[PDB]
Design a protein around this ligand. Structure first.
Ligand SMILES: O=P(O)(O)O[C@H]1[C@H](O)[C@@H](OP(=O)(O)O)[C@H](OP(=O)(O)O)[C@@H](OP(=O)(O)O)[C@H]1O
Length: 117
């Protein structure tokens, strides 16, 4: 129960709009249960934590590193209920990008091992 809701990684990034393709600052949090949740403002209390702006599930996701429109961009391709979506993110160095994509992949792998169990 508690290991599943551990926070694996959290931090700020920019998230690109889907239609108005601007970079928007968002605070994201990845948990062992595959939830990847974003906030306009970094949450300061539990109530704030419970009300994210963005919520994805990273089970079986794909992780793509790209250099356009900006270097150090990454794309997650994941399932949102029954629709496959892509979301685009940016951090300021390739090392930071690798930290995020590896953490997301580690969580996804964990969920897969749980299934296989
Ligand atoms: O603002 P524009 O360019 O019109 O497009 C919006 C933003 O990309 C939202 O991201 P953000 O909340 O980070 O601004 C996104 O929310 P999600 O990424 O949470 O899905 C909306 O998807 P919808 O969820 O389909 O509304 C999408 O329609």
């Amino acid at each position: 129960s508690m290991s599943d809701v551990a926070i694996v990684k959290e931090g700020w990034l920019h998230k690109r709009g889907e239609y108005i393709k601007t970079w928007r600052p968002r605070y994201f949090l990845l948990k062992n249960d595959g939830t990847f949740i974003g906030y306009k403002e970094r949450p300061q209390d539990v109530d704030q934590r419970e009300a994210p702006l963005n919520n994805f599930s990273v089970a079986q996701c794909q992780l793509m590193k790209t250099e356009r429109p900006r270097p150090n961009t990454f794309i997650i391709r994941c399932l949102q209920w029954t629709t496959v979506i892509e979301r685009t993110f940016h951090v300021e160095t390739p090392e930071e990008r690798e930290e995020w994509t590896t953490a997301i992949q580690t969580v996804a792998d964990g969920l897969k091992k749980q299934e296989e169990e």
